[PDB]
């Protein structure tokens, strides 16, 4: 069907199984002193994390104070200059002998592809943390400073009123 | 189109009667019993007329073929189109007749003719019983 | 190879986010009638803490199951209103998820 069937073990665990789970896990721990499914109550025991700390799904694999970059910068600049130079040479190829133009085209793309690699090491979450950091920091400083400004102006008004009433005495 | 027009007007008046009985039941105070009986009987006999007239003109309704308008936009009104398109019964009625058939559960044919003869015999017996005593 | 129970339970949890899946599951009588399914739903609650929460793909179901948790004391009735209510309350629920995680 369109919707896959519920998992099979879901139907094994009734309320009685839930209430008898404590004694079952106590007995299992006492006896113990891929997990084989010898009893229907085994699944409620929390599954163990794989030792390799890896998870595979759909053909793809998955697994501290914030809780020479100049070399990369100059590499990027020289790569951009070489990319412009190669673009000029490739368009010249198109001009004179376009029949073999593709011979350079993908080459240029490789440099562009390398640029993407040069982005990968530069990857930005810390920079986003920084920018959010300063925006809420400056917002709270603005709120604070307007607080002492308003309380100070109220105090100044109170002192002026006190002087006015003392003069009228 | 004439048959569907008559179906339209009769179903419209039936829906009007339903709206009526609705807005006189929605009141916090229940009216007199007799008014409720009158409304019930009128609306229910009207439903009978609806059923009979729908029975009469099945051929005209069947002959008609449903097709969306060229001017009607389905991109924006696909939800509205699907709302009227769907026809599956409400589930509770479904398991209702499923349990009904479960409870009910050449042999069948001869039971059928035995039911025929019981029906005819009972009809004749009650005709005789009515004729036995003068009711006028 | 045969996937482990981790993979199937995680995929079930992430598929619970679909409104169509929830509507289909609640359409059948015996799914809600059987206490086994709700027992499994309450068992699934323990994935809201790390490091399990680091393995999720769509955080919305995190509330949905919790919303489904509410369904055991709110009633089936309300199944029809489920798509409308999720569409209407998507903004504030996404905001509260962001507050729970992004802050």
């Amino acid at each position: 069907s369109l919707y896959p069937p519920p998992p099979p073990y879901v139907k094994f665990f009734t309320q009685s199984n839930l209430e008898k789970l404590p004694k079952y896990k106590e007995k299992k721990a006492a006896s113990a002193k891929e997990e084989e499914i010898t009893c229907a109550l085994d699944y409620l025991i929390p599954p163990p994390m794989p030792k390799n700390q890896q998870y595979r799904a759909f053909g793809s694999i998955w697994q501290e104070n914030e809780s020479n970059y100049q070399y990369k910068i100059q590499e990027l600049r020289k790569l951009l200059k070489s990319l412009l130079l190669n673009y000029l040479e490739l368009i010249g190829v198109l001009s004179i002998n376009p029949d073999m133009y593709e011979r350079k085209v993908e080459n240029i793309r490789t440099i562009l592809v390398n640029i993407h690699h040069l982005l990968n090491e530069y990857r930005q979450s810390r920079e986003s943390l920084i920018m959010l950091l300063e925006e809420q920091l400056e917002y709270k400083r603005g709120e604070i400073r307007e607080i002492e400004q308003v309380c100070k102006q109220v105090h100044d008004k109170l002192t002026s009123i006190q002087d006015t009433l003392r003069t009228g005495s | 189109g004439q048959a569907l027009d008559a179906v339209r007007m009769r179903l419209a008046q039936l829906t009007h009667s339903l709206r009526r009985i609705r807005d006189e039941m929605s009141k916090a105070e229940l009216p007199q019993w007799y008014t409720l009986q009158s409304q019930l009987n009128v609306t229910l006999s009207q439903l009978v007329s609806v059923t009979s007239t729908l029975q009469h003109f099945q051929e005209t309704l069947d002959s008609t073929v449903v097709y969306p308008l060229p001017k009607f936009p389905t991109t924006s009104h696909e939800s509205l189109v699907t709302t009227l398109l769907r026809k599956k019964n409400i589930p509770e009625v479904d398991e209702w007749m499923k349990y009904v058939r479960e409870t009910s559960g050449e042999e069948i044919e001869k039971l059928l003719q035995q039911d025929r003869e019981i029906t005819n015999w009972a009809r004749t017996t009650f005709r005789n019983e009515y004729g036995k005593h003068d009711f006028k | 190879p045969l996937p482990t129970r981790f993979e199937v339970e995680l995929e079930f949890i992430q598929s619970l986010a679909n409104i169509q899946y929830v509507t289909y599951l609640l359409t059948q009588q015996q799914i809600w009638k059987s206490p086994n399914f709700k027992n499994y739903l309450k068992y699934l609650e323990y994935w809201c803490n790390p490091p399990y929460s680091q393995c999720i793909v769509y955080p919305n179901c995190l509330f949905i199951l919790k919303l489904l948790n509410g369904f055991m004391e709110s009633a089936l009735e309300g199944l029809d209103e489920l798509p409308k209510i999720i569409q209407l309350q998507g903004p504030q629920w996404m905001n509260e998820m962001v507050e729970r995680w992004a802050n």
Binding site: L2 | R19, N89 | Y24
Partner: peptide
Amino acid sequence: PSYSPTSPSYSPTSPSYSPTSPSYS
């Protein structure tokens, strides 16, 4: 003329009961 038109009694909240099953290829 027409004494009164009918009030709109649309029920979009109705969930419908369309059976879906031939999705797998």
